[model samples]
Target: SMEQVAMELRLTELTRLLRSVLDQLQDKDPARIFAQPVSLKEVPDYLDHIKHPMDFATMRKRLEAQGYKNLHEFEEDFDLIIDNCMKYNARDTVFYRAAVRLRDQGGVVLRQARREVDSIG
Candidate 1:
């Protein structure tokens, strides 16, 4: 049960990460760049009445509000999100691999986020 929730959280987090990336990419406006990437289309649809975890449009707004102002800020945000998602997804895959009967992916996610946060300042 815990694993299920954790996975859902990871998925939600992945959406956030994508949103951040989109935010950075907004200035570049590479709508065409994502057109070729399969992962871009992999954006999950929400079930039930739940709000979708992330949306590119909203992320654009948030990033604009931050006043990133340049490509460097966008690049930094992109790098952080990529690093975090890579770590989180790696642990998530490990959890599902059946090598372990059960695994906790939260620590990995938390640690990766912390690393990004620490490096930011």
Candidate 2:
């Protein structure tokens, strides 16, 4: 139970830190803080068009180094990051961009597989 309690405590702290960082970004650039929300389905194509796939790769490695070894772990972290970005009115900030890139790039192999199947069909 102690480990679970500790994990919860750490999550709370990390969430608070994420909120603070978002707030700071909003303060720095209020005008560019929140653009129209990007669609999840389009994220992969969006990142590819922008030629920023490496941003996602970098964040993936960062998360992996921080002990996020699975898709669920990465998804949870991305959800928190995006939720905080939305909460703080900074959804279009680099943090959010990086998260989107991470999510999209992470799914490349799966997307390719689906595309191949559709082609054959």
Candidate 3:
């Protein structure tokens, strides 16, 4: 298919962009809790309260499988993770604070990525 090449190029670019962002997120979280799922044992009945659960591990695997069609899909999962964190943990809590920081940092990262992607052919 003629469309394959363009899609392939775009997706691979998006993939590498997200990989960079994920790396920054890891660096952003010195505690490293963001790297994995919130243990159900740590938060009883977590899934019952949060409709969608997402973490860095799952996001990384999805990236490995090329699961996202575009930047929107990838960011949606990132938003989901932060939203759940804020919803489940009060803004005054540690998780909420970390989520907020990562949210801000991730926004800057996305902005940089978009600008770079904009310059692409």
Best by lDDT: 3
Going through the candidates in the order shown, the clash numbers are 0, 0, 0
**Minimal lDDT window, size 10, model 3:** 112-121
List per-prediction Cα lDDT, in the order shown: 0.40, 0.43, 0.83
Q: After superposition, how far is residue 65 of candidate 1 from its true place, in Å?
A: 2.1
Q: Write one digit per residue (lDDT tens) for candidate 3, span 1-121.
A: 8799978978887788778877876677787767888888988899899988999899999998888877778889989888999999887999999999988888888887677767763
Q: Candidate 3: where is the Cα deviation over 4 Å?
A: 1-6
Global fold similarity of model 2 (TM-score)? 0.33
Best first by TM-score, ranked = 3, 2, 1
- Write out the backbone clash pairs for model 2: none
Please give the TM-score that candidate 3 achieves against the real structure. 0.87
Point out the higher-scoring one by lDDT: 1 or 2: 2
Using TM-score as the measure, name the better of candidate 2 and candidate 3: 3
Candidate 3's C-alpha lDDT? 0.83
| Candidate 2 C-alpha error for residue 28, in Å | 1.6
lDDT (10s digit) by residue, model 1, range 1-121: 9998976665555445545545344334333321221243463432222222233343355454543443345445444433433333444663223212211222344455546544642
Runs in model 1 deviating more than 4 A are 1-59, 91-121
